[PDB]
Each structure stands twice: as C-alpha cells, then as structure tokens.
Amino acid sequence: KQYIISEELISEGKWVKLEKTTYMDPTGKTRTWESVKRTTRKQTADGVAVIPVLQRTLHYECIVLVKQFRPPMGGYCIEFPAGLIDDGETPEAAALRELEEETGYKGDIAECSPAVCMDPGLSNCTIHIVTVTINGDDAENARPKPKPGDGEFVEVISLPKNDLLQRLDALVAEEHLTVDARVYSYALALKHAN
C-alpha cells in the first residue's frame, strides 16, 4: 500500500548523505520525508555488531563491550564491538575481524541475524547482529591484542551477563557514559526473561 515514488539528493558528504524522499501514504496522498543514508554501502547491510559472550570456566559469563569517543555524540559511549562490512566481506567474517581489532579476542560464530535496522525513522542504516562465543580459556584469548585500525581508540569493558543491566546503569551514573540502545535492550531482556 505505501511505497517510494522518488528520492532527491539534498547533501552528500564523504561518509553520509541527506535525501528528500517522496512516498505514497496509504490514503493515496503523496508525502515527503528527510532520510539519512551512508555513502559506503555495496553488502547485506552497512555493518555488523557483535554480541561477544566471553566464557571462562569458574567465572561468570561476560558480555564484552567497548568504550570509545563518538564525535556525533560529543562523548564516550559503551557499545557492542562493531564496524562496517568491507566490500565482498561476509557478515560472519566482518564480525570476527571487528571483534579481534576492537577487543583482541578470537571468537566462534554462534548465530547471525538478518539485516536489522538502526533508526528507521531517520536512516536506512542496517546491521547484522552476530552472536559470538569466546573461549577465554584458550591460549589465543589469554592476553588479547586489540589491533586498532588507524584513528580508532577503543577500551574494552567486560561485564557479567547475569547482572548486565545493573552494571550498565552504574557506569552511566558513575562515569557519565552513554550506553548504546542495542546493548541496553539486550540487558533489559536478560532481566525480563521468564
């Protein structure tokens, strides 16, 4: 019933553009929307985010997260490890690569979502969410080496899965960080389960 009629370029950066979208509303009236898109998509999706489940025996399972300065936010954010998918890279491969560059951990794929949207009232940005387990008892994950690309500066924060929401709420109040909505949603469901 609703569909895109045309798209007008408003402004095009190196990394992001703004478009004016005309679409048919379901009454048969034509309407406009301001839409953001990345300039980098090729790919199943723009990016991957990794849910990295760090498993060490005799320890709580942790979720591995990352803290970095985010210029659009003007501050530091706590997020799942994540990055854009390289041209001709598979989402699974982007996930293991990003996880290793951002955390130093070497992981195994558990499951991979379909392309899911990031903020669909504003942008067309999508990701695959890739669940990965990390055998923290293996030697390759003993002293994990974060291999930042150029211009990336990432701290690693591992939090216990079974107290995640309370741990996140603490970091916000105590450290004035911004938690990522996907991270927060995950944490909420861990509490809301049963």
Ligand X SMILES: CCN(CC)c1cc(C)nc2ncnn12
Site residues, ligand X (CB under 6 A) = 15-16, 32-34, 84, 121-122, 151
Q: Which of 52, 83, 104, 144 binds Mg ion (CB under 5 A)?
A: 83
What interhelical angle do 181-192 and 164-175 show, nearest 10? 140
Q: Which of residues 127-156 bind a copy of itself (CB under 8 A)?
A: 127, 129, 131, 151, 153
Contacts 24+ apart (CB under 8 A), 184-190: 186/51, 186/63, 190/161, 190/162, 190/164, 190/165
Cβ proximity to ligand X, 7 vs 61, nearer residue:
7
Q: Does 28 bind a copy of itself (CB under 8 A)?
A: no
Cβ proximity to Mg ion, 9 vs 116, nearer residue:
116
DSSP structure class, residue 46: S
Question: To which residue do tokens 């709420």 refer?
Answer: 169
Q: Does 29 bind Cl ion (CB under 5 A)?
A: no
Q: Does 4 bind a copy of itself (CB under 8 A)?
A: yes
Cα-atom radius of gyration of the chain, to the nearest Å?
19
Q: Does 132 bind Mg ion (CB under 5 A)?
A: no
Q: Which of 58, 192, 193, 194 binds Cl ion (CB under 5 A)?
A: 192
Partner from a copy of itself, ligand X, Mg ion, none binding residue 109, C-beta < 5-8 Å depending on class? none
Cβ proximity to ligand X, 16 vs 112, nearer residue:
16
Measuring CA to CA, which residue among 39, 44, 134, 133 is closest to residue 89?
Answer: 44
Q: Residue 38 is encoded by which pair of tokens?
A: 């990345």
Measuring CA to CA, which residue among 191, 142, 151, 148 is closest to residue 169?
Answer: 191
Is 12 annotated to bind a ligand? Reply is no
CB of 139 to a copy of itself, least distance (A): 26
Asked if residues 149 and 136 have their Cβ atoms less than 8 Å apart, the reply is no
Is 182 annotated to bind a ligand? Reply is no
Asked if residues 78 and 180 have their Cβ atoms less than 8 Å apart, the reply is yes
Cβ proximity to ligand X, 23 vs 184, nearer residue:
23
Cβ proximity to a copy of itself, 119 vs 140, nearer residue:
119
Which positions make up the binding site? Answer: 15, 33-34, 38, 70, 82, 84, 98, 102, 119, 152
